[PDB]
Structure formats: structure tokens, C-alpha cells
Amino acid sequence: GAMGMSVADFYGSNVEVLLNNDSKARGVITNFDSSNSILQLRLANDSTKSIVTKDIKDLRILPKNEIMPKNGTKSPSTNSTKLKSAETYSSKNKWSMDCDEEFDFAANLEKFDKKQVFAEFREKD
């Protein structure tokens, strides 16, 4: 059905847009200017880019979450390689204090990061 919406709802929402050259990009909106129509998109990969809306060829909004259970006939809400059956629900309230999203939970004491580390620091021992 149709519902009333506000400009603040679009700000900070995650949408994807194709530019005039048929390239696609997605992220969460971080700024919008009515004087020159300029939009900054910040995506959950810690990357942000400022793009003027006039080069928007096409716009879409990605599903943040699914309200109903997944039967299988419908397509996946997001693009991923493999899903773990042990993991399914995240963030009991809304989000986590550490980072923007929680991933690689593992068993804490065992398998901290697939037995591999990029930076060295050793918090203890």
C-alpha cells in the first residue's frame, strides 16, 4: 500500500544506484544538498564516496531485512557466498557497539580468525 514518508528516512538509508555508464554502486546515504543535488554514500565496507545525483542513471533500495520467513522460492535479500546453518539471527536489539556489523563470531577462545592474522598486537600474553 502507500505510506507517508519523510526526507530524513532517505538520509542514512542503504540504496543502490546505476550511473550513466551502467555501473552499479550501493551504500548508506550520508549527505544530500538541495542547492546542487549532491549525495555522499557511505557503504559498510568502511568506504565513502561523494557523487552528484545528476549522474544517477537509475535508483533502487535494497532490503535491509526480511519481515517474513524465507521459503526458498524468493531470491536472497543480499549477495553472499555461503550461509552458516548455526548462524541466522544477529543484534538482539538493533546493532553492536563494536564495528558496524558482527561477523566471524567463532567460539571466542578457539578459531579467533581462521588461524590467520593480518596485523600483530597481542592484547594479552
Distance between CA atoms of residues 39 and 17, nearest Å: 11
Q: If DSSP codes are grouped into helix, strand and coil, which group holds residue 75?
A: coil
Count Cα atoms within 13 angstroms, Cβ side, for 16.
Answer: 11
Residue-range definition of the domain harbouring residue 43: 1-62
Q: What is the CATH number of the domain that holds 44?
A: 2.30.30.100
3-class SS at 100? Answer: coil
* Number of Cβ atoms within 10 Å of the Cβ of 36: 8
* Dist. CA 90–CA 71, nearest whole Å: 20
| Identity at 100, one-letter amino acid code | D
Closest CA to 42 of 60, 15, 81, 64: 15
